[PDB]
mmCIF file of all heavy atoms in Angstrom:
data_model
loop_
_atom_site.group_PDB
_atom_site.id
_atom_site.type_symbol
_atom_site.label_atom_id
_atom_site.label_comp_id
_atom_site.label_asym_id
_atom_site.label_seq_id
_atom_site.Cartn_x
_atom_site.Cartn_y
_atom_site.Cartn_z
ATOM 1 N N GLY A 36 170.168 172.938 232.228
ATOM 2 C CA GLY A 36 171.004 173.170 231.086
ATOM 3 C C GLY A 36 171.213 171.937 230.250
ATOM 4 O O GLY A 36 172.204 171.814 229.524
ATOM 5 N N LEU A 37 170.275 170.996 230.335
ATOM 6 C CA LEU A 37 170.353 169.752 229.579
ATOM 7 C C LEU A 37 169.011 169.389 228.973
ATOM 8 O O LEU A 37 168.036 170.160 229.070
ATOM 9 C CB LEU A 37 170.846 168.612 230.461
ATOM 10 C CG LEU A 37 172.223 168.813 231.104
ATOM 11 C CD1 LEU A 37 172.486 167.768 232.176
ATOM 12 C CD2 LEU A 37 173.291 168.755 230.034
ATOM 13 N N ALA A 38 168.936 168.219 228.323
ATOM 14 C CA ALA A 38 167.697 167.776 227.687
ATOM 15 C C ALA A 38 166.538 167.760 228.683
ATOM 16 O O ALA A 38 165.432 168.149 228.359
ATOM 17 C CB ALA A 38 167.905 166.391 227.097
ATOM 18 N N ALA A 39 166.818 167.324 229.923
ATOM 19 C CA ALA A 39 165.816 167.269 230.952
ATOM 20 C C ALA A 39 165.122 168.621 231.135
ATOM 21 O O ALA A 39 163.908 168.739 231.011
ATOM 22 C CB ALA A 39 166.416 166.812 232.260
ATOM 23 N N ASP A 40 165.933 169.648 231.413
ATOM 24 C CA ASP A 40 165.392 171.001 231.591
ATOM 25 C C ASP A 40 164.990 171.611 230.261
ATOM 26 O O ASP A 40 164.349 172.669 230.224
ATOM 27 C CB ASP A 40 166.424 171.882 232.277
ATOM 28 C CG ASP A 40 165.895 173.288 232.556
ATOM 29 O OD1 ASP A 40 164.995 173.418 233.397
ATOM 30 O OD2 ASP A 40 166.426 174.252 231.942
ATOM 31 N N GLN A 41 165.345 170.955 229.165
ATOM 32 C CA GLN A 41 165.020 171.434 227.821
ATOM 33 C C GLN A 41 163.546 171.190 227.521
ATOM 34 O O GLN A 41 162.893 172.026 226.883
ATOM 35 C CB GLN A 41 165.900 170.738 226.777
ATOM 36 C CG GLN A 41 166.438 171.688 225.726
ATOM 37 C CD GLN A 41 167.540 171.077 224.888
ATOM 38 O OE1 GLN A 41 168.730 171.256 225.160
ATOM 39 N NE2 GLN A 41 167.144 170.312 223.875
ATOM 40 N N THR A 42 163.052 170.041 227.957
ATOM 41 C CA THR A 42 161.653 169.697 227.745
ATOM 42 C C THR A 42 160.741 170.242 228.843
ATOM 43 O O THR A 42 159.521 170.306 228.696
ATOM 44 C CB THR A 42 161.495 168.159 227.654
ATOM 45 O OG1 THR A 42 162.547 167.513 228.354
ATOM 46 C CG2 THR A 42 161.489 167.640 226.235
ATOM 47 N N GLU A 43 161.362 170.636 229.956
ATOM 48 C CA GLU A 43 160.637 171.188 231.079
ATOM 49 C C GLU A 43 159.414 170.349 231.426
ATOM 50 O O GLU A 43 158.303 170.863 231.626
ATOM 51 C CB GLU A 43 160.186 172.632 230.776
ATOM 52 C CG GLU A 43 160.205 173.538 231.983
ATOM 53 C CD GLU A 43 160.598 174.964 231.640
ATOM 54 O OE1 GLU A 43 161.788 175.211 231.403
ATOM 55 O OE2 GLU A 43 159.684 175.837 231.628
ATOM 56 N N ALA A 44 159.615 169.042 231.487
ATOM 57 C CA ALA A 44 158.523 168.108 231.817
ATOM 58 C C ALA A 44 159.062 166.806 232.419
ATOM 59 O O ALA A 44 158.885 165.725 231.857
ATOM 60 C CB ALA A 44 157.706 167.823 230.566
ATOM 61 N N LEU A 45 159.715 166.936 233.574
ATOM 62 C CA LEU A 45 160.276 165.765 234.247
ATOM 63 C C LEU A 45 160.838 166.140 235.609
ATOM 64 O O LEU A 45 161.962 166.626 235.733
ATOM 65 C CB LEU A 45 161.372 165.120 233.378
ATOM 66 C CG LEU A 45 162.184 166.082 232.511
ATOM 67 C CD1 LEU A 45 163.170 166.877 233.347
ATOM 68 C CD2 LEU A 45 162.917 165.329 231.398
ATOM 69 N N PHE A 46 160.039 165.911 236.651
ATOM 70 C CA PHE A 46 160.451 166.248 238.016
ATOM 71 C C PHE A 46 160.611 164.974 238.852
ATOM 72 O O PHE A 46 159.944 163.963 238.593
ATOM 73 C CB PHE A 46 159.456 167.197 238.658
ATOM 74 C CG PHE A 46 159.071 168.349 237.748
ATOM 75 C CD1 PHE A 46 157.743 168.703 237.584
ATOM 76 C CD2 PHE A 46 160.044 169.072 237.094
ATOM 77 C CE1 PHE A 46 157.399 169.723 236.768
ATOM 78 C CE2 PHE A 46 159.700 170.107 236.266
ATOM 79 C CZ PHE A 46 158.374 170.451 236.107
ATOM 80 N N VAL A 47 161.468 165.037 239.871
ATOM 81 C CA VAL A 47 161.695 163.894 240.753
ATOM 82 C C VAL A 47 160.389 163.287 241.222
ATOM 83 O O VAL A 47 159.593 163.952 241.904
ATOM 84 C CB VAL A 47 162.541 164.301 241.960
ATOM 85 C CG1 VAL A 47 162.909 163.067 242.774
ATOM 86 C CG2 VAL A 47 163.770 165.087 241.551
ATOM 87 N N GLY A 48 160.149 162.034 240.860
ATOM 88 C CA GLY A 48 158.941 161.359 241.245
ATOM 89 C C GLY A 48 158.317 160.539 240.116
ATOM 90 O O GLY A 48 157.445 159.718 240.358
ATOM 91 N N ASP A 49 158.802 160.770 238.899
ATOM 92 C CA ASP A 49 158.287 160.046 237.739
ATOM 93 C C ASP A 49 158.917 158.651 237.656
ATOM 94 O O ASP A 49 160.069 158.454 237.996
ATOM 95 C CB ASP A 49 158.602 160.831 236.458
ATOM 96 C CG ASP A 49 157.394 161.605 235.934
ATOM 97 O OD1 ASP A 49 156.380 160.943 235.595
ATOM 98 O OD2 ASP A 49 157.470 162.844 235.896
ATOM 99 N N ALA A 50 158.107 157.697 237.197
ATOM 100 C CA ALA A 50 158.584 156.318 237.075
ATOM 101 C C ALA A 50 158.768 155.926 235.640
ATOM 102 O O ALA A 50 157.821 155.750 234.874
ATOM 103 C CB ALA A 50 157.585 155.363 237.771
ATOM 104 N N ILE A 51 160.036 155.774 235.223
ATOM 105 C CA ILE A 51 160.374 155.409 233.850
ATOM 106 C C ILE A 51 160.034 153.938 233.595
ATOM 107 O O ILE A 51 160.835 153.041 233.899
ATOM 108 C CB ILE A 51 161.867 155.651 233.551
ATOM 109 C CG1 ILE A 51 162.262 157.069 233.933
ATOM 110 C CG2 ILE A 51 162.149 155.384 232.084
ATOM 111 C CD1 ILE A 51 163.710 157.201 234.327
ATOM 112 N N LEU A 52 158.840 153.705 233.033
ATOM 113 C CA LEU A 52 158.401 152.330 232.754
ATOM 114 C C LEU A 52 158.659 151.951 231.285
ATOM 115 O O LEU A 52 158.478 150.820 230.894
ATOM 116 C CB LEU A 52 156.917 152.175 233.090
ATOM 117 C CG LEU A 52 155.972 152.930 232.141
ATOM 118 C CD1 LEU A 52 155.542 152.048 230.987
ATOM 119 C CD2 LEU A 52 154.761 153.436 232.896
ATOM 120 N N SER A 53 159.064 152.960 230.496
ATOM 121 C CA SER A 53 159.361 152.714 229.078
ATOM 122 C C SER A 53 160.155 153.866 228.483
ATOM 123 O O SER A 53 160.056 154.999 228.947
ATOM 124 C CB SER A 53 158.047 152.519 228.313
ATOM 125 O OG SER A 53 157.514 151.213 228.528
ATOM 126 N N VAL A 54 160.915 153.569 227.438
ATOM 127 C CA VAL A 54 161.725 154.581 226.774
ATOM 128 C C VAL A 54 161.978 154.203 225.314
ATOM 129 O O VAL A 54 162.458 153.110 225.014
ATOM 130 C CB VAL A 54 163.090 154.782 227.490
ATOM 131 C CG1 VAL A 54 163.823 155.950 226.884
ATOM 132 C CG2 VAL A 54 162.880 154.972 228.966
ATOM 133 N N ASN A 55 161.678 155.128 224.407
ATOM 134 C CA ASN A 55 161.875 154.912 222.986
ATOM 135 C C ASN A 55 161.086 153.686 222.518
ATOM 136 O O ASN A 55 161.515 152.964 221.621
ATOM 137 C CB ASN A 55 163.367 154.712 222.668
ATOM 138 C CG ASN A 55 163.779 155.384 221.374
ATOM 139 O OD1 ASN A 55 163.105 156.277 220.879
ATOM 140 N ND2 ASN A 55 164.910 154.958 220.820
ATOM 141 N N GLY A 56 159.912 153.476 223.095
ATOM 142 C CA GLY A 56 159.084 152.349 222.733
ATOM 143 C C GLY A 56 159.571 151.058 223.342
ATOM 144 O O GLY A 56 159.258 149.970 222.839
ATOM 145 N N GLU A 57 160.329 151.141 224.429
ATOM 146 C CA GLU A 57 160.863 149.953 225.096
ATOM 147 C C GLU A 57 160.233 149.793 226.468
ATOM 148 O O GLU A 57 159.756 150.770 227.078
ATOM 149 C CB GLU A 57 162.382 150.039 225.196
ATOM 150 C CG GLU A 57 163.095 148.839 224.619
ATOM 151 C CD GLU A 57 164.555 148.753 225.017
ATOM 152 O OE1 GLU A 57 165.177 149.817 225.174
ATOM 153 O OE2 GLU A 57 165.038 147.639 225.197
ATOM 154 N N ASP A 58 160.233 148.576 226.980
ATOM 155 C CA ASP A 58 159.673 148.282 228.304
ATOM 156 C C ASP A 58 160.789 148.157 229.355
ATOM 157 O O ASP A 58 161.523 147.176 229.352
ATOM 158 C CB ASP A 58 158.856 147.010 228.261
ATOM 159 C CG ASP A 58 157.416 147.252 227.834
ATOM 160 O OD1 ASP A 58 156.836 148.254 228.306
ATOM 161 O OD2 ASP A 58 156.871 146.442 227.049
ATOM 162 N N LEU A 59 160.879 149.160 230.230
ATOM 163 C CA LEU A 59 161.888 149.141 231.281
ATOM 164 C C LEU A 59 161.359 148.453 232.541
ATOM 165 O O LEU A 59 162.000 148.474 233.596
ATOM 166 C CB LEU A 59 162.305 150.580 231.632
ATOM 167 C CG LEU A 59 163.818 150.813 231.672
ATOM 168 C CD1 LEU A 59 164.484 150.314 230.407
ATOM 169 C CD2 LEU A 59 164.125 152.277 231.906
ATOM 170 N N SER A 60 160.189 147.811 232.420
ATOM 171 C CA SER A 60 159.591 147.097 233.555
ATOM 172 C C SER A 60 160.355 145.799 233.846
ATOM 173 O O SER A 60 160.113 145.147 234.888
ATOM 174 C CB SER A 60 158.132 146.788 233.271
ATOM 175 O OG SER A 60 157.392 147.976 233.022
ATOM 176 N N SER A 61 161.249 145.435 232.939
ATOM 177 C CA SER A 61 162.047 144.218 233.093
ATOM 178 C C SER A 61 163.485 144.493 232.627
ATOM 179 O O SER A 61 163.972 143.849 231.703
ATOM 180 C CB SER A 61 161.441 143.059 232.317
ATOM 181 O OG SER A 61 160.063 142.906 232.613
ATOM 182 N N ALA A 62 164.129 145.447 233.267
ATOM 183 C CA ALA A 62 165.496 145.826 232.927
ATOM 184 C C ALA A 62 166.156 146.562 234.074
ATOM 185 O O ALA A 62 165.935 147.749 234.270
ATOM 186 C CB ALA A 62 165.498 146.688 231.656
ATOM 187 N N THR A 63 166.944 145.819 234.852
ATOM 188 C CA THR A 63 167.661 146.381 236.006
ATOM 189 C C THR A 63 168.145 147.813 235.716
ATOM 190 O O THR A 63 168.246 148.213 234.559
ATOM 191 C CB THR A 63 168.862 145.495 236.370
ATOM 192 O OG1 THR A 63 169.700 145.289 235.271
ATOM 193 C CG2 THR A 63 168.433 144.139 236.894
ATOM 194 N N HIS A 64 168.439 148.559 236.780
ATOM 195 C CA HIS A 64 168.904 149.932 236.623
ATOM 196 C C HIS A 64 169.993 150.063 235.586
ATOM 197 O O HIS A 64 170.165 151.113 234.958
ATOM 198 C CB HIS A 64 169.361 150.495 237.955
ATOM 199 C CG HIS A 64 169.243 152.005 237.995
ATOM 200 N ND1 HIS A 64 170.303 152.853 238.255
ATOM 201 C CD2 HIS A 64 168.186 152.789 237.761
ATOM 202 C CE1 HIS A 64 169.875 154.083 238.181
ATOM 203 N NE2 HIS A 64 168.609 154.082 237.877
ATOM 204 N N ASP A 65 170.764 149.025 235.404
ATOM 205 C CA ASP A 65 171.854 149.028 234.448
ATOM 206 C C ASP A 65 171.331 148.937 233.019
ATOM 207 O O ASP A 65 171.978 149.401 232.086
ATOM 208 C CB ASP A 65 172.850 147.900 234.724
ATOM 209 C CG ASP A 65 173.877 148.276 235.762
ATOM 210 O OD1 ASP A 65 173.499 148.837 236.811
ATOM 211 O OD2 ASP A 65 175.084 148.003 235.531
ATOM 212 N N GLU A 66 170.150 148.366 232.883
ATOM 213 C CA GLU A 66 169.531 148.224 231.579
ATOM 214 C C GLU A 66 168.781 149.504 231.227
ATOM 215 O O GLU A 66 168.609 149.835 230.042
ATOM 216 C CB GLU A 66 168.577 147.038 231.559
ATOM 217 C CG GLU A 66 169.270 145.701 231.700
ATOM 218 C CD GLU A 66 169.129 144.814 230.477
ATOM 219 O OE1 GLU A 66 167.982 144.697 229.956
ATOM 220 O OE2 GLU A 66 170.143 144.250 230.022
ATOM 221 N N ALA A 67 168.398 150.247 232.243
ATOM 222 C CA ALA A 67 167.702 151.505 232.044
ATOM 223 C C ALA A 67 168.701 152.607 231.772
ATOM 224 O O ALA A 67 168.494 153.464 230.922
ATOM 225 C CB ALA A 67 166.834 151.844 233.233
ATOM 226 N N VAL A 68 169.820 152.547 232.470
ATOM 227 C CA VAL A 68 170.877 153.531 232.298
ATOM 228 C C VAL A 68 171.640 153.257 230.991
ATOM 229 O O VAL A 68 172.092 154.183 230.331
ATOM 230 C CB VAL A 68 171.882 153.499 233.483
ATOM 231 C CG1 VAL A 68 172.914 154.611 233.314
ATOM 232 C CG2 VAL A 68 171.110 153.652 234.805
ATOM 233 N N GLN A 69 171.704 151.992 230.621
ATOM 234 C CA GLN A 69 172.374 151.604 229.386
ATOM 235 C C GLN A 69 171.433 151.852 228.224
ATOM 236 O O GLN A 69 171.908 152.150 227.097
ATOM 237 C CB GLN A 69 172.822 150.144 229.432
ATOM 238 C CG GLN A 69 171.704 149.144 229.200
ATOM 239 C CD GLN A 69 171.540 148.781 227.749
ATOM 240 O OE1 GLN A 69 170.720 149.374 227.038
ATOM 241 N NE2 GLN A 69 172.296 147.798 227.272
ATOM 242 N N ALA A 70 170.153 151.718 228.467
ATOM 243 C CA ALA A 70 169.153 151.965 227.444
ATOM 244 C C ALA A 70 168.947 153.446 227.214
ATOM 245 O O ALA A 70 168.516 153.863 226.135
ATOM 246 C CB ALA A 70 167.850 151.285 227.837
ATOM 247 N N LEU A 71 169.254 154.252 228.234
ATOM 248 C CA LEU A 71 169.104 155.694 228.126
ATOM 249 C C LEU A 71 170.369 156.333 227.605
ATOM 250 O O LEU A 71 170.338 157.425 227.014
ATOM 251 C CB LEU A 71 168.752 156.277 229.488
ATOM 252 C CG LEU A 71 167.283 156.056 229.918
ATOM 253 C CD1 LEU A 71 167.097 156.446 231.385
ATOM 254 C CD2 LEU A 71 166.340 156.846 229.034
ATOM 255 N N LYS A 72 171.491 155.666 227.819
ATOM 256 C CA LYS A 72 172.794 156.182 227.343
ATOM 257 C C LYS A 72 173.094 155.680 225.938
ATOM 258 O O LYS A 72 173.910 156.275 225.239
ATOM 259 C CB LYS A 72 173.914 155.778 228.317
ATOM 260 C CG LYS A 72 174.385 154.336 228.160
ATOM 261 C CD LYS A 72 175.223 153.890 229.347
ATOM 262 C CE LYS A 72 176.294 152.913 228.927
ATOM 263 N NZ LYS A 72 177.645 153.530 228.865
ATOM 264 N N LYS A 73 172.446 154.583 225.543
ATOM 265 C CA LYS A 73 172.663 154.025 224.227
ATOM 266 C C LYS A 73 171.496 154.375 223.289
ATOM 267 O O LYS A 73 170.830 153.492 222.736
ATOM 268 C CB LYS A 73 172.815 152.498 224.308
ATOM 269 C CG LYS A 73 174.149 152.055 224.901
ATOM 270 C CD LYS A 73 175.224 151.994 223.824
ATOM 271 C CE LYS A 73 176.417 151.193 224.296
ATOM 272 N NZ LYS A 73 177.590 152.067 224.580
ATOM 273 N N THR A 74 171.276 155.679 223.115
ATOM 274 C CA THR A 74 170.189 156.147 222.248
ATOM 275 C C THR A 74 170.595 157.416 221.525
ATOM 276 O O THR A 74 171.540 158.102 221.924
ATOM 277 C CB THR A 74 168.925 156.387 223.050
ATOM 278 O OG1 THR A 74 169.241 156.755 224.400
ATOM 279 C CG2 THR A 74 168.000 155.178 223.115
ATOM 280 N N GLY A 75 169.886 157.756 220.457
ATOM 281 C CA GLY A 75 170.190 158.953 219.687
ATOM 282 C C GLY A 75 168.946 159.567 219.082
ATOM 283 O O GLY A 75 167.873 158.964 219.077
ATOM 284 N N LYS A 76 169.105 160.776 218.548
ATOM 285 C CA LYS A 76 167.972 161.479 217.933
ATOM 286 C C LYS A 76 166.854 161.686 218.957
ATOM 287 O O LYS A 76 167.125 162.032 220.105
ATOM 288 C CB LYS A 76 167.482 160.677 216.707
ATOM 289 C CG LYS A 76 166.899 161.568 215.613
ATOM 290 C CD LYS A 76 166.286 160.734 214.507
ATOM 291 C CE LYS A 76 166.001 161.565 213.258
ATOM 292 N NZ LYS A 76 165.342 160.768 212.198
ATOM 293 N N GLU A 77 165.601 161.507 218.535
ATOM 294 C CA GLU A 77 164.462 161.700 219.421
ATOM 295 C C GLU A 77 164.399 160.599 220.464
ATOM 296 O O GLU A 77 164.503 159.421 220.146
ATOM 297 C CB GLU A 77 163.168 161.740 218.615
ATOM 298 C CG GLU A 77 162.509 163.091 218.544
ATOM 299 C CD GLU A 77 161.944 163.415 217.174
ATOM 300 O OE1 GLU A 77 161.315 162.535 216.573
ATOM 301 O OE2 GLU A 77 162.156 164.563 216.699
ATOM 302 N N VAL A 78 164.267 160.994 221.724
ATOM 303 C CA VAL A 78 164.202 160.045 222.836
ATOM 304 C C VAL A 78 162.877 160.151 223.576
ATOM 305 O O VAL A 78 162.664 161.116 224.318
ATOM 306 C CB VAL A 78 165.369 160.255 223.823
ATOM 307 C CG1 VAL A 78 165.391 159.144 224.844
ATOM 308 C CG2 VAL A 78 166.687 160.351 223.086
ATOM 309 N N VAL A 79 161.994 159.176 223.375
ATOM 310 C CA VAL A 79 160.702 159.174 224.040
ATOM 311 C C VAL A 79 160.787 158.523 225.414
ATOM 312 O O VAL A 79 160.690 157.299 225.550
ATOM 313 C CB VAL A 79 159.648 158.420 223.191
ATOM 314 C CG1 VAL A 79 158.258 158.595 223.800
ATOM 315 C CG2 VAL A 79 159.671 158.900 221.757
ATOM 316 N N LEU A 80 160.983 159.343 226.443
ATOM 317 C CA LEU A 80 161.087 158.856 227.812
ATOM 318 C C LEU A 80 159.697 158.675 228.440
ATOM 319 O O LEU A 80 159.164 159.594 229.040
ATOM 320 C CB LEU A 80 161.929 159.836 228.646
ATOM 321 C CG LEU A 80 163.220 160.327 227.995
ATOM 322 C CD1 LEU A 80 163.406 161.824 228.228
ATOM 323 C CD2 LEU A 80 164.406 159.543 228.505
#
């Protein structure tokens, strides 16, 4: 009932290495959660 299930393309096991054209390969979980919570409009996960 959220964006996740809205795109129907994200199951447990995927590795978020980038989001919205950003590199999460160097951003602690807090930077990934903050980078995912601090976004709007289209979100390229």
